Ligand binder design. Structure first.
Ligand SMILES: [Zn+2]
Ligand SMILES: [Zn+2]
Ligand SMILES: [Zn+2]
Lengths: 66, 59, 47, 1109
């Protein structure tokens, strides 16, 4: 739904690196260079960042009326 | 003919279900179809076998 | 207790005292209402 | 040349123009536009026994979906979400224009309301089918929902397609061995409301008999021929065929009816068969009416239609004789040319026809009764429309269709995206489970491109429940009249004209024995000079737009047969192909260039005569090529997409051509059950059971169809660092090892939602009413503490911790002395109250819904699977410190035993692991579509080596407990995993003691009923085999239905022991006999008592407990 705070395999914080990576890739930059220069080197954290879906931007429209 | 990809009246090894590839190498589409056709019987025979075995053992 | 009009999600709040012939929002005439979170401190363990 | 990209562009345009549920929508639109009016034209006008009084029907129409609530006035339009929330039905009113004539007086046309018709979502009648994404979001709708279902009473119902044999066709076969019948032919004529089967035999003595359901026994062929207007034997033998060899076989059947030489003799012979002990007159009219109504109704139900029935019977007899002489073979019955798929349109038109017949019968009865009583003519005052609305709805909410069909309507399976998508494309075989037959479950070569060869259930339904292929399309059909006219004007000669030319003109039959027979929907149409030329002409005219595209033509040439078959009816499954002319496909570079920039679509190519949909019958004349690089001048078509032979779930497997066949079927079955996001608006809709994965991820190793179906926006799994090694023995025999630290970070956590509902029934029968209030003093009170969560209005508030059997909604019920009927939480499960909804059910009754959620964290016993058929439970959870870290600090998320690979032969598993590791390292997309995988394995391995890792995807691993370096290298990957809804938290159930049955006094059944396990016969056999008598007694007697009963010493019946003062009393002996107590199973005493209920008298003979000596 939203980016996990930490990588699942190793406890590395990865949530703070989502909004840069999600932007510069949309700007035409290849993901590998951005990931390397952001400080992500183990492929577990690369898996965490590369396969996020971010559904919450659609669920904010359909929220419990409580 | 089995499929429409083969000529009329063809009994060549390829046209009747001979797979010359391996799982490592990968199968062609018609080879996949022939493999599934060959393997479908196992999904079916199990229930019949167990029911007959149960009836015989009860008697 | 207290309810909330269902139209446009969190619309507005109403209570038991609104006595009407049917279940209806007095303000927008909507037929679906929900219940509030009963304001009270709730303790959940971050496990 | 057509490369991969151009063919994928064609396929993507196909999917973009027409969605994945085009079959349901097309059938419903066709029914709504045409089949609705046709039913009432078939009715025509209602007559009355009283002369001068009748009604003439006009047009019929429908409006936007709406409801009529309390204080009925103008109808108010509603949205589907409101129907879901308020338990309504998404239906639209239907208006009929009717004119009453009263002794030939017109009056004025009247438009009335005749009922409500359910509307399929996204159909032509649904106003939400043409809305922008913004407006769909505004009204509370999922923009990606492929609406092909109905909202009935709030539930979502889908009409499953039913596959069954074609009706108006002749099927020939051999008779059973060792029987007087040698060959059999069968026809199943379908009328507008009933279906009649006609069976033709060929007995041992070279005679032919026709027998159908209504008339008992067999009737000789010449008898029926005479009854239908064929008086001369030459007429019969020339209507059968023109071949002297075939004509020679008619002699015994011709002479067996030599006594009957007139139509009336045949008619009263049939009458004697059907009517016994009546005069000649009523006999002949009864026989002629039963012949005209129940013989072959599809040809007509009028007394001038007998010639057509006679010609049809003659053609069927000719077919059976051709089978006898050896010029034919028995029909396959599995060829898809012989099978038709009934969809929602046909079922709805039949149901509406039946309901309209019932409604018009009731209306005419009420009208004639009122006119007998005496009243003015006011149609609106006696319509009683609520019949129609009741008859259709009850069919959708139960699945019991007309004609004996059951299970046609089923609740939509919204476990995830793939479950709903697969449900909306299922096909169920009608003739099934009555016998295996070991041949209806085979993978017929005709299924290529029409049904998925993998997605089938396992067990009794294996091979009988199928799923549509990607590009398959079910035909809708046209009217036969235009096809007949164009065929006649093309040059064919009617059978009557040929017979006339043969008989009344001196022309030899040798000329017409070399001609080709021309059929139309299984009925012989005529003769043509050269059948191949006619087939080519029809095909060329169809591609130019002059002829409808629903028409398919085939030409069959054999050493003994020369026929042309034309089909234009509905229910035929067809597939598209690119036309190849002179070895060059008709789709060129300019066409694909215009296709890639939106100038043209898939439909434009079809209407230009470059891509055509062909069915099984036409494909007999086709010679298709898989790829453009092996085209030859003899080829006629080209495959649009070779990977489109799979279904919609089998299209998610990466590298499916490297796995064994059963693994893909298992994968489909398990992928229909994975946890994940199933809808964007899941928080506002109320489903009975729902699951939600907290952090779903889209696969790293994708296929081309994952993005088309929208699976990347509603994923149902996560990517896991998989290690392949043997570790601690906790992953032996299908089990897996999972990292506990990654679980504690929230990897595979999920939430489970359950719903409870209640309604305040108004009870109009006695004017008493329900009320939702607490239960201070009531008859069926439970306990003071149980009702401690209810508010002042008797409904529990959101965000509270319910547990066990706490009361959620508290209401009382009037006696039928108020009784407490309150909804309680199910036993053995707790959670947090998530949502409370209060509304009205269209009549002022209060409806209350309470949704309760709970948190599910993975543990030992949870079930996980992959996309290659590798299910298993978690054996143990290991922390990060104890996991075998590598030289870079990466620990596995899941460990999989190597011993599971070499037997299952799933190379795709390892290939996906390598591809996922490459995708994570490089950041480049990986496509694993079958037969077209890019990049190749060698390139991926070279790139992996270039990025600092070993090419074979192995790594140097150290032991996390001792720090010792392992002597070998271990394979690591990023395989994608799914979590199934088979959690151990819902499967435990234990019983020590509790309630028993009222009748047998045995423990109850069900997890919610405190439990109880059945001790069957086979367990008793195991206990006997071990020879443990006391253990048997303990298991079967002491722990269930033990009792003590008193038996009289003389009669042997059961007495009793009363508390008056003191007595052992016998039902017959009174106090003159001694009674003894015996311990026995209470079920045995019940058996004795119910045996005495019958006239059987069981007397028990007692014996000494202590063995003397
Ligand atoms: Zn990491
Ligand atoms: Zn409101
Ligand atoms: Zn007695």
């Amino acid at each position: 739904m939203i980016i996990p705070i930490r990588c699942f395999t190793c406890g590395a914080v990865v949530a703070d690196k989502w909004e840069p990576f999600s932007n510069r890739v949309m700007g035409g930059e290849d993901p590998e260079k951005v990931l390397t220069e952001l400080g992500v080197n183990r492929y577990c954290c690369r898996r965490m960042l590369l396969s996020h879906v971010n559904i919450i931007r659609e669920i904010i429209h359909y929220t419990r009326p409580i | 003919r089995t499929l429409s990809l083969f000529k009329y009246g063809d009994i060549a090894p390829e046209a009747r279900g001979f797979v010359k590839n391996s799982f490592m190498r990968g199968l062609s589409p018609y080879e996949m179809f022939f493999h599934a056709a060959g393997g479908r019987e196992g999904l079916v025979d199990t229930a019949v076998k167990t029911s007959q075995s149960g009836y015989m053992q009860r008697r | 207790a207290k309810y909330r009009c269902g139209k446009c999600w969190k619309e507005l709040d109403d209570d038991q005292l609104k006595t009407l012939p049917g279940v209806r929002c007095p303000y927008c005439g909507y037929r679906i209402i929900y219940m509030v979170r009963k304001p009270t401190v709730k303790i959940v363990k971050a496990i | 040349m057509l490369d991969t990209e151009s063919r994928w562009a064609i396929a993507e345009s196909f999917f973009k123009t027409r969605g994945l549920v085009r079959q349901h929508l097309d059938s419903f639109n066709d029914f709504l536009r045409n089949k609705l009016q046709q039913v009432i034209y078939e009715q025509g006008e209602i007559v009355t026994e009283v002369p001068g009084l009748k009604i003439k029907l006009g047009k019929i129409r429908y409006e936007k979906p709406s409801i009529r609530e309390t204080d009925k006035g103008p109808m108010r339009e509603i949205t589907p979400m409101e129907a879901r929330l308020r338990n309504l039905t998404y239906s639209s009113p239907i208006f009929l224009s009717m004119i009453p004539v009263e002794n030939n007086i017109e009056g004025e046309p009247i438009e009335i309301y005749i009922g409500d018709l359910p509307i399929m979502l996204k159909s032509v009648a649904d106003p939400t089918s043409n809305l922008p994404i913004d407006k769909l979001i505004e009204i509370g709708e999922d923009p990606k929902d492929p609406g092909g279902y109905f909202i009935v009473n709030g539930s979502e119902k889908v009409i499953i397609a039913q596959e069954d044999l074609a009706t108006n066709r002749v099927l020939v076969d051999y008779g059973k061995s060792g029987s007087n019948i040698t060959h059999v032919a069968k026809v199943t004529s379908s009328a507008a409301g009933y279906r009649v089967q006609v069976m033709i035999e060929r007995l041992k003595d070279s005679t032919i008999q026709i027998s159908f359901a209504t008339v008992p026994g067999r009737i000789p062929f010449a008898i029926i021929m005479r009854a239908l207007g064929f008086v001369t034997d030459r007429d019969i033998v020339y209507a059968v065929s023109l071949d002297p060899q075939i004509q020679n076989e008619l002699l015994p059947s011709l002479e067996q009816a030599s006594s009957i030489t007139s139509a009336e003799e045949a008619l009263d012979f049939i009458g004697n068969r059907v009517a016994i002990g009546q005069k000649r007159e009523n006999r002949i009219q009864k026989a002629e009416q039963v012949i005209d109504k129940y013989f072959l109704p599809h040809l007509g139900t009028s007394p001038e239609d007998r010639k057509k029935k006679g010609y049809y019977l003659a053609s069927a007899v000719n077919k059976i004789l051709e089978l006898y002489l050896g010029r034919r073979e028995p029909d396959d019955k599995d060829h898809y040319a012989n099978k038709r798929v009934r969809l929602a349109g046909d079922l709805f038109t039949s149901l509406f026809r039946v309901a309209f017949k019932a409604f018009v019968k009731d209306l005419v009865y009420q009208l004639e009764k009122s006119k007998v009583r005496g009243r003015r003519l006011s149609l609106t005052a006696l319509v009683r429309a609520d019949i129609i609305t009741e008859r259709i709805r009850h069919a959708l909410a139960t699945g019991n269709w007309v004609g004996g069909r059951t299970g046609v309507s089923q609740l939509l399976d919204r476990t995830n995206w793939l479950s709903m998508l697969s449900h909306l494309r299922r096909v169920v075989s009608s003739l099934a489970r009555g016998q295996p037959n070991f041949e209806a479950r085979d993978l017929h070569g005709t299924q290529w491109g029409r049904m998925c060869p993998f997605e089938t259930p396992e067990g009794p339904n294996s091979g009988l429940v199928k799923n549509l292929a990607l590009l398959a399309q079910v035909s809708v059909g046209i009217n036969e009249s235009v096809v007949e006219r164009v065929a006649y004007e093309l040059g064919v000669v009617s059978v009557e004209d040929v017979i006339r030319r043969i008989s009344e003109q001196n022309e030899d039959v040798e000329k017409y024995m070399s001609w080709s027979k021309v059929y139309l929907n299984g009925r012989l149409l005529g003769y043509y000079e050269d059948g191949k030329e006619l087939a080519k002409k029809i095909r060329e005219s169809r591609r130019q737009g002059k002829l409808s595209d629903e028409v398919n033509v085939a030409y069959i040439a054999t050493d003994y047969l020369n026929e042309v078959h034309i089909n234009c009816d509905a229910g035929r499954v067809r597939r598209p192909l690119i036309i190849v002319n002179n070895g060059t496909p008709l789709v060129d570079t300019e066409d694909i260039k215009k296709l890639k920039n939106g100038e043209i679509t898939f439909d434009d190519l079809v209407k230009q005569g470059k891509i055509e949909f062909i069915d099984a019958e036409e494909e007999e004349n086709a010679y298709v090529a898989l790829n453009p690089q092996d085209l030859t001048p003899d080829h006629t078509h080209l495959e649009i997409w070779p990977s489109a032979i799979l279904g919609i779930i089998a299209s998610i497997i990466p590298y499916p051509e490297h796995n064994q066949s059963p693994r893909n079927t298992y994968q489909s079955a398990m992928a229909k059950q994975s946890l994940g996001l199933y809808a964007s608006n899941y928080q506002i809709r109320t489903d009975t059971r729902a699951h939600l994965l907290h952090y779903p991820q889209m696969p790293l190793v994708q296929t081309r169809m994952l993005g088309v179906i929208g699976y990347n926006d509603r994923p149902a799994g996560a990517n896991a660092i998989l290690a392949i090694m043997s570790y601690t023995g906790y992953n032996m025999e299908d089990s897996i090892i999972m990292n506990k630290s990654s679980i504690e970070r929230g990897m595979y956590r999920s939430t489970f939602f359950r719903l409870y509902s209640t309604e305040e029934v108004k009870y109009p029968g006695g004017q008493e009413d329900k009320i939702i209030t607490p239960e201070a003093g009531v008859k069926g009170y439970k306990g003071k503490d149980y009702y401690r969560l209810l508010e002042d209005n008797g409904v529990v508030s959101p965000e509270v911790e319910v547990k066990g059997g706490d009361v959620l909604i508290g209401k009382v019920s009037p006696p039928r002395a108020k009784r407490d009927t309150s909804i309680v939480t199910r036993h053995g499960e707790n959670g947090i109250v998530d949502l409370v909804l209060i509304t009205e059910t269209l009549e002022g009754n209060k409806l209350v819904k309470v949704r309760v959620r709970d948190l599910r964290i993975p543990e030992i016993g949870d079930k996980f699977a992959t996309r290659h058929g590798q299910k298993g439970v978690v054996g143990i959870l290991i922390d990060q410190v104890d996991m075998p870290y590598t030289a870079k600090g990466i620990v596995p998320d899941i460990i999989l035993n190597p011993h599971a690979l070499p037997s299952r032969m799933t190379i795709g598993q390892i290939m996906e692991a390598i591809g996922g590791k490459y995708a994570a390292l490089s950041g480049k997309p990986v496509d694993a579509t079958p037969f077209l995988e890019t990049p190749k394995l060698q390139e991926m391995q070279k790139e992996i080596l270039k990025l600092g890792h070993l090419p074979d995807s192995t790594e140097v691993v150290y032991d996390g407990r001792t720090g010792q370096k392992l002597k070998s290298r271990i394979l690591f990957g990023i395989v994608y995993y799914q979590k199934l809804h088979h959690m151990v938290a819902d499967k435990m159930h234990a019983r020590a003691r509790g309630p028993v049955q009222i009748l047998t006094r045995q423990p109850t059944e069900g997890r919610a009923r405190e439990g109880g396990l059945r001790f069957g016969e086979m367990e008793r056999d195991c206990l006997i085999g071990f020879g443990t008598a006391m253990l048997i007694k303990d298991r079967l007697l002491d722990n269930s239905d033990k009792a003590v009963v008193y038996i009289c010493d003389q009669c042997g019946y059961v007495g009793w022991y009363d508390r008056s003062k003191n007595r052992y009393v016998c039902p017959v002996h009174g106090d003159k006999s001694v009674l003894h107590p015996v311990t026995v199973s209470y079920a045995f005493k019940l058996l004795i008592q119910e045996l005495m209920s019958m006239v059987i008298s069981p007397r028990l003979i007692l014996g000494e407990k202590v063995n003397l000596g």
